[PDB]
Design a protein around this ligand. Structure first.
Ligand SMILES: *[C@@H]1O[C@H](CO)[C@@H](O[C@@H]2O[C@H](CO)[C@@H](O)[C@H](O)[C@H]2NC(C)=O)[C@H](O)[C@H]1NC(C)=O
Lengths: 49, 49, 77
């Protein structure tokens, strides 16, 4: 559900304590939409795409 | 050698550190020095002697 | 999304903790002038020329995390 709080106790190897989060929710649009991110890599490898 | 890599770290049942958590990877050599079996799956500790 | 077997009944072979024997030394630090384990430029190559490069390296002369493996106890065969 919306407004949910997440919390997990952590170990001293990462410093102990808790990792926490808060989350919210959004319902549908009629036409369900998607987000795309596109990133090319220039000279890292064989230029083959 | 064999290397196992992850993000979560936990301690064992007796208290010594060593468990890990969620998706993780390990590589395994075999074939007397030819076979590199590599994966990033999930472990499942066995509860025997 | 994979497939793979499982080995035996849940009864692990008896592993010990005897690092005291394993804590011996064979000191071998690294040397970049000996080119001791350095990544090559992953993107392109050059020839007969000297170039600066920003990359992932170890510090020169480190003593590292040397380990070693060994067999277990045995009696005869
Ligand atoms: C690689 O670079 C070296 C350094 O310049 C080249 O060696 C020199 O080449 C010139 C060419 O006339 C000579 O006059 C110099 O005496 C050379 N230097 C030494 C120390 O001998 C070398 O020729 C280059 N290699 C290639 C294949 O081009």
């Amino acid at each position: 559900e919306d407004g949910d709080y997440y919390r997990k106790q952590l170990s001293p190897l990462e410093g102990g304590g808790w990792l926490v989060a808060s989350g919210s929710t959004v319902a549908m649009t009629e036409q369900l939409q998607m987000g795309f991110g596109i990133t090319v890599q220039y000279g890292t490898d064989t230029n083959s795409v | 050698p064999a290397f196992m890599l992850g993000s979560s770290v936990g301690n064992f049942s007796d208290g010594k550190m060593g468990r890990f958590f969620n998706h993780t990877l390990v590589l395994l050599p075999d074939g007397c020095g030819t076979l590199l079996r590599a994966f990033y799956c999930i472990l499942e500790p066995r509860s025997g002697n | 999304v994979d497939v793979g077997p499982d080995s035996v009944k849940s009864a692990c072979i008896e592993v010990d903790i005897q690092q005291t024997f394993f804590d011996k030394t064979w000191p071998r630090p690294i040397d970049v002038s000996k080119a001791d384990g350095i990544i090559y430029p992953q993107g392109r190559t050059y020839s007969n020329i000297t170039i600066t490069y920003q990359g992932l390296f170890p510090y020169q002369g480190d003593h590292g995390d040397m380990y070693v493996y060994s067999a277990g106890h045995a009696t005869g065969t």
